[PDB]
Design a binder for this molecule. Sequence first.
Ligand SMILES: Nc1ncnc2c1ncn2[C@@H]1O[C@H](COP(=O)(O)OP(=O)(O)O)[C@@H](O)[C@H]1O
Ligand SMILES: Nc1ncnc2c1ncn2[C@@H]1O[C@H](COP(=O)(O)OP(=O)(O)O)[C@@H](O)[C@H]1O
Ligand SMILES: Nc1ncnc2c1ncn2[C@@H]1O[C@H](COP(=O)(O)OP(=O)(O)O)[C@@H](O)[C@H]1O
Ligand SMILES: [Mg+2]
Ligand SMILES: [Mg+2]
Ligand SMILES: [Mg+2]
Lengths: 515, 515, 515
Amino acid sequence: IDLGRVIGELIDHRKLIISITSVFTLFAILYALLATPIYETDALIQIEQSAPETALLQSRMILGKTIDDLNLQIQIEQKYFPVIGRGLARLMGEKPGNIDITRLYLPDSDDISNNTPSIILTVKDKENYSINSDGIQLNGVVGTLLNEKGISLLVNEIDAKPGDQFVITQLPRLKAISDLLKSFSVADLGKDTGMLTLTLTGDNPKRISHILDSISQNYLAQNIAVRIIDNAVTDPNPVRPKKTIIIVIGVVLGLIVSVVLVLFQVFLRRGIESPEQLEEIGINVYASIPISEWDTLLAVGNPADLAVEAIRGLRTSLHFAMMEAKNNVLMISGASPSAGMTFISSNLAATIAITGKKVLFIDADLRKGYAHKMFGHKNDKGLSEFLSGQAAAEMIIDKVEGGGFDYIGRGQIPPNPAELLMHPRFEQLLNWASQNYDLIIIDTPPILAVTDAAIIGRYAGTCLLVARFEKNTVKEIDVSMKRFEQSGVVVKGCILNGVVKKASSYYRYGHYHYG
Amino acid sequence: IDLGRVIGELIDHRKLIISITSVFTLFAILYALLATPIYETDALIQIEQSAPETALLQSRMILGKTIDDLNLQIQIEQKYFPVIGRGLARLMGEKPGNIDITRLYLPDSDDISNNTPSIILTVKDKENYSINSDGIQLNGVVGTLLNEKGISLLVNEIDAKPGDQFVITQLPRLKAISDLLKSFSVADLGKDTGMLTLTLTGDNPKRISHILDSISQNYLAQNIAVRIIDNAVTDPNPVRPKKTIIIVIGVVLGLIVSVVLVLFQVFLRRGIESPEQLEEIGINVYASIPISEWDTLLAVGNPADLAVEAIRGLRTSLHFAMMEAKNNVLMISGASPSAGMTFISSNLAATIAITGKKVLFIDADLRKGYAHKMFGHKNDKGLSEFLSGQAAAEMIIDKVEGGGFDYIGRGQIPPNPAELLMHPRFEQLLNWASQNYDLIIIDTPPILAVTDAAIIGRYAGTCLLVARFEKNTVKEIDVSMKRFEQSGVVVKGCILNGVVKKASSYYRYGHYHYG
Amino acid sequence: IDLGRVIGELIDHRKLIISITSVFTLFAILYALLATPIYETDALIQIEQSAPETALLQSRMILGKTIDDLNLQIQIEQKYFPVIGRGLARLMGEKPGNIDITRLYLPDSDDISNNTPSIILTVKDKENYSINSDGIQLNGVVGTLLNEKGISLLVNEIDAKPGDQFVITQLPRLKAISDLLKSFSVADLGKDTGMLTLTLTGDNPKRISHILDSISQNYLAQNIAVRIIDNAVTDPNPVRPKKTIIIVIGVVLGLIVSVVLVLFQVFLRRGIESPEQLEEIGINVYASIPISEWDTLLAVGNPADLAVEAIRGLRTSLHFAMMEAKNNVLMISGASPSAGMTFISSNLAATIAITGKKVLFIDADLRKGYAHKMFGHKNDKGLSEFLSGQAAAEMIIDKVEGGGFDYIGRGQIPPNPAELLMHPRFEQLLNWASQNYDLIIIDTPPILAVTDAAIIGRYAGTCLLVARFEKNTVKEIDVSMKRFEQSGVVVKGCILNGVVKKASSYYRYGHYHYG
Ligand SMILES: Nc1ncnc2c1ncn2[C@@H]1O[C@H](COP(=O)(O)OP(=O)(O)O)[C@@H](O)[C@H]1O
Ligand SMILES: Nc1ncnc2c1ncn2[C@@H]1O[C@H](COP(=O)(O)OP(=O)(O)O)[C@@H](O)[C@H]1O
Ligand SMILES: Nc1ncnc2c1ncn2[C@@H]1O[C@H](COP(=O)(O)OP(=O)(O)O)[C@@H](O)[C@H]1O
Ligand SMILES: [Mg+2]
Ligand SMILES: [Mg+2]
Ligand SMILES: [Mg+2]
C-alpha cells in the first residue's frame, strides 16, 4: 500500500470519520460538564516518628470520634430523578439546598440486604415538610421534634425552595467510617520531618474543611491525654473531573476507532472498483456507465444526462465491435439481478433508434420482465403467448411512445420459462425479425440464477455482460463468462454500470458535464 | 491466510461459538452466584519489636486458649443434600438457622480414619429434637441435658424452623487450631511501628468478629502476665467470591476455547469446497447443484425448486457437450456412495423429458438400485432377468408416471453382478435402445467400491462423475478419474452436488430464487 | 529516491518553504518581544535540620502573615485593551503607572462563580479619579477616604498620566496565598548545611524583593518566639521569556513543518511531468509546448513566442508522420477539457498556413466551440446548419483575417450533437474539402466526456491527443487511447502542452530563446 491510497480512503469515508469523532467528543464533553465536581481540603500538622501517627490518624477510634461529633451518619442527598439532573441543575445556576438535621432515628428495618434505612422528605414551605418512608405520609414542622410511627426526626433551618425532595439515610457507623477513610489521606511530605500533610476530598467544599478540622482537633486532643501549623482550607478549584484531559482522550479515542473502522471496511471490500480489475482477467470493458441521480426511459426524459452520454459512447463502440458478426442480434445479460441489464438494454435501444436505425427490443425475461410497464403496454400477447403457440408474430410487436423503436413484451408469466425458450419458434421469430430490422436487442435474466440466457445466446451474434459497480466481484463475472463458454456462447465483453466518484480510485472516467 | 477467510469462518461457525461461550459464561455465573460468601474482620493492635509477637499470636497456646473459650471444637453445619442447596437457599432469602451448643461429648469411635465423630440433629419444634448417630434415634429437649448411649449433649436456643437437619461434629483440638490458623493473618503494615493488623476470614460475619476479639483479649491478657486500638469489626461486603473477575474470566475462556476449536475444524477439513478445487486439477465442472430442502421425483413434485433450476443448467451444458459423441448414451457415476448419482440421473431424465425428447433411464445398479421404488414399479423382469436370459427386451421397459420417460429397473438382485454386465446381451440392449430413443441415461454404482461402472462405460459415449459437496475430496475424484482412464473409459467431467451456503467460500453460485 | 530529486524539489518549493519559515519565525519573535518579562529575587538563610523548615516556610501561617503585612490581597493591574498592549507600551519606552492603595473594601458580591470583586479606576489628574464597578460612576480624591455605595477605598500617591485606567481586584486571602506559593521556592543548596536559598519570581522587580524580605523577617521573627545571611535582591536580567531558545525553536519548527509539507505534496502528485512517463507506456510524444506567458491567435500576434517555436517543431514532425496516411485529415483531441486542444489546433493551422499550403480548420466542437470568436466571425451558417441540412458547403467557409487559412465554425449549438455528426453529410463535406485543400484540421471535444471525437475519427487519416502538463495523468491518457482503439480509431500519438520549468525535472526541453 501507499499513502495516496490511504488518503483517498480517508477522503471517501470522511462522513463516517467525522460523525464518529463528533459523537465521541460530544460524550466526553457531556461527561466533563455533568460530572459532579470534587474539591480538596488540606491541613499541616507538626510532630515533635510520624510513622505510627499515620496509622493512628486512619484508625477507627479517631475517625469514629469525628463522625460522632459531626453526625456524619446522617446522609442527606438532594433528589434528582435522572443521572444528569444534578449536573444540569448546577449548570443552570440553581443553588443546591441543604437541611440541618441534629437527630435521626429510623425504625431500623435491618433486613437481609438493606442495612441502611432511608426516608424521603418533601419541602412544603420554610416551616413544615412531608415525610414518607414506604408510603406512610407524615407532616412535620421545623423546631418541634417528631416521634411517630417508630420514627424520630429533628429538622432545623430548612434552606431550599418548596417542592424539593431530599433522601435522608441513616447509614451504619462502620459505613460512615469507611466512607470517611476512603477520601482521607495522610502523608509525610519530607519522609523525615515532623510535618504531616492531611488531605480530604468531597463534593461539599465547606463540609470537608469542617471534617478535617474535626479530625485534627480530635487527634491533637487525644495525643495530649503535636502542633497544628495549618488548619484545613479548601482549594476552590475542583480536582475532579479533569476536563481537558478527558476531552483530549475522547477526541483521540474517536479518531482511533474511526481509523480502525475504515481500515476494517477497506480490508473487507471485494467488489469491482475499476475496469482494470476486469481487464487484468482478460475481459474487454466497452463502457462505464455512471449512476444517473435524475417508469420512464432516461434516454428520452433527460437525453443530456451523463449516463446517456456514456451510453452513446457504448453505441459507438458497438457499431465497430458488431462488424463481422454472424447476425444483427445483440444479447445483454449479467451475473446477478439488479445489475442494470434492463436499464442498459432499453436506453441503448433508445440511443440507437435516434440515429435513424430500425430497432427491435425483445424482453426475453419470462420470469420478471417489466419492460411493458416502462414502455406503455397492451400486456396481452407477449413472447409467452407466441412461444406457447397461441399468438402470431404480428400481434406481439408494439411501439415505444417516446422512443422510436419496436418492442416485444414478455407476456403472461409461464410455468416453464426455460422450456418455452427452447422451442424452434424462437429461432423462427429471430430469423424473421432479422430481415425487417437493422438491430435486435434481447434482454435476459441473469446467468448465475437461471439458464435462460444460455439458451437465448445460441442465436445471438453478439453477447455482452453487465457488471454492477460495487456489488459484483471479479470472480462472479469470470464464473458467468465460463458458464456461458461451456454452453457454446462466446461473450464479447462487459459493461460496468452504476459507477460513482471515489477519491481512492485514481481512475478517471469522463463522468462530468461538458457544455 | 487473510482476514476475509477467518471472518467468514467465524460467521459460519457462529452457532458453535455462541453456544460454547454461553455455556461457559452460564457456568461462571452459576459459580459466582452459588459460592458461599466469605467475610473479613480485622483489628488493630499497638506494640510499645513486633517480629516475635507475630509468631506468638499464631502459636498454639494463644489460639488453643481462644478455641477453649469459644468452644470452636463443636462444628455445626446446616444440612443441604446437594452442593448447591445452600446457595439456592441463600438466594431465595431463607434465613440460615443456628443452634447454641455448650456441651458435646460423642462416644469417640476413633477408628483408623474417621477421627471426627459426627451426629445428625433434626428439629421437631422450638423445644424438642431428634438425634441420630448411626441410626440410633434419641429424643432430646432444649434445657435438660442428655447423657445417653455414651453420648452427652446440651442444646440451648434452637432458632430455626421444624424439619431442619444439622450435622454436629466434634473435631479434635489440633484440627480446630489448624482451621483457625488457616484463616488468620497478622501483618505489621508499617514494618517498623508498634502497629499490627490482625485479619480473620469466614462465612459467619459475627462469629469471626467474636473470634478475633477473643484472640486479641487473650494475647493482651497473656502479655500483661500492648494496646488494642481497634477492636474487631467485619466488613459487610464479602471478599470472596469476586464476581466480576470470575465472569470476565469465564467469558474470555469461552471465547478462546471457541476460537481454538473453530481453528481446529478449519485446519482439519479436506472435502471439496468450490468447483475451483476440481478445476485446478484439470477437471471440468458442468454444474453445481444445491441441497433441496424441500419416494418422489423432485423435478416433478417441485419443478420450481432451485436444484431443478441448476439441473436445467446442466441440461443445457450437456446438449452442447454431447455433440460429436459416438452414441446417445450417457453414464452417470461417482466415487463414493450417496454422493447423489441416482438423484442427478433421475432428475436429469425428467428435465430432458419435459422438452419433448424420448428418454430411456436404465438402473444398472444391480447391487443397491432402488429406482423402481421411486418410479412406481412392477418389480418383475428387470435388467437382471434380461441379462441372465430369462426375459426379453420388451418386457422390462416401463413408464414413469409423473415423469414422461421410460425406464428399466434393476430386477432381482443377482449373485454375480459384475459378470452379468459383461454379457454381450448388454451391448445388444444398448444398440437396440439407441435407435428407439433420443437419449439413454445409465445409473451405476460408485467406481471406488466396485468395478461395474467401468464395464458399463465402454458402451457409453459420455460419462460424468458426481462429487458430493463436502464429503468427497479432490484426491478421491482424481483417483476415480484415473481408475476410469485405466480401463479405457474417458470421463468428460464432474457434477458437484449438495452445495450449501458458506460465508467463508467467496464463491458465488446462483442458488437463489428469481421470480 | 536520490539527493538530486529532493534538492530539486526544495528548489521548486522554495517560495512556500521560505514563506512558512518566515511566518513561524515572525510569530516567535513577536512572542519573545511581547511576553511580559519575569524577574527573580533571592535570599540566603542560615539554619543552626532544614527539612521541616522548608515546610514551615511554605505554610499558610507565614505566607498569610506576609500577605497581611504587605496587603497582597489588593491586586492592581494597569489596563490595556489588547493582549499585546502591555508589550507594545513597554517597547515604546512608556513608564508603567502605579497606585498605592492602603484600604480596599468592595461590596463582596460573592455570586456562584465570581468570588473576586473588581472595579475600574480612571485617572483624571494627579489628585482626583473616577471609579466604576458596574456602571456606577463615583468621584474620589487622593487623601480623603471614600465610603460610598457599600464601597470603601483609600488611594495614595497616584503616579501616572491622566486617562490611564486600572483594574482593582479584591481577591480572597487563600487566592493570594496560593499565588504567592506558586512563585516561591525553597532549596537547601548543600543538602546538609544550614544554608537555605529562597527564591521568588514576578514581573515587578522591587515588589518581589520586598515580599521576600517580608517572608524572611516573618520566618526569623516567628522562630525566635536562624540568621539571614543574604537579604533579598533581584537579578536585573529577566529569567523569562528566554528569547534565543524561543527564536531557535521557532526557526526549527518552521523548517520541519515546511519539509513535511513539501514531502506531502511530492508524495501526492500524480500528473504527467515529462514525456518519458508517456513513452514508457508506449505513446509517441511529438512535441512539448511550453506555457506562453504573453481572442487572438498567438502564432499571429507573437510569431517569435517560444510556444510557436515548439509548434513549428510539431509541424516538421507531422510533415513526416502524415506521409502514407489515407487522407489529408488531421484530428486533434484529448482526454479532459482545457488541455489545450483548440490552442494547439488553431496555432498549428496558422504555422502551416504561413508555409504556403492551403489549410481548412473545422471547429467540430458542437457543444462548446468558440473558434468563431477567436477568428472574427459571421456566426450564421456553421457546421450545425450544414449537418441539419439548412446550409450548403459554400456558405459556411470563412477566412481567418490575420491567419491565412479557411475555417468552418460550429454554428448554432444543436440539441443532438453526437447524432448530427453521424450524418453521411459529414463524410460528404470531408471528401469535398479533401480535394480543394492540402490539409484539414478538425478540433473536437475531449473523448472521456463525450463520444463525438470517436465518431469524427473514422474519417481522419491522422489523430493526435493533447495532454496537459500537470493536470492529466498517465492513466487518463492510456484510457483515452484505449477508448479510441475500441471504436476503431488509431491514435498516432500525443502532444504535451503547457510545460513549465521545474528544478526537480532533470528533463531538458528547448524552451529558451535563441536569437
Ligand atoms: N446507472 C444507473 N443509474 C440510475 N439507475 C440505474 C442505473 N442502472 C440501473 N438503474 C436502475 O436501478 C434499478 C435496477 O436495475 P435493472 O436494470 O432493472 O436490473 P436487472 O439487472 O435485474 O435487469 C432499476 O430501477 C434501474 O432503472
Ligand atoms: N442436492 C440434493 N438435494 C436434496 N437431496 C439430495 C440431493 N442429492 C442427493 N439427495 C438425496 O440424498 C439421498 C442419497 O443420494 P443418492 O442419489 O440416492 O445416492 P447414490 O450416489 O448412492 O446413488 C438420496 O435420498 C437423495 O434423494
Ligand atoms: N501552452 C499554452 N500557453 C498559453 N495558453 C494556453 C496554452 N495552452 C492552452 N492555452 C490557453 O488556455 C485556455 C484553455 O485551453 P483550450 O485550448 O481552449 O482548451 P480545450 O482543450 O478545452 O479545447 C485557453 O484560453 C488557451 O488559449
Ligand atoms: Mg431486468
Ligand atoms: Mg444410487
Ligand atoms: Mg476546445
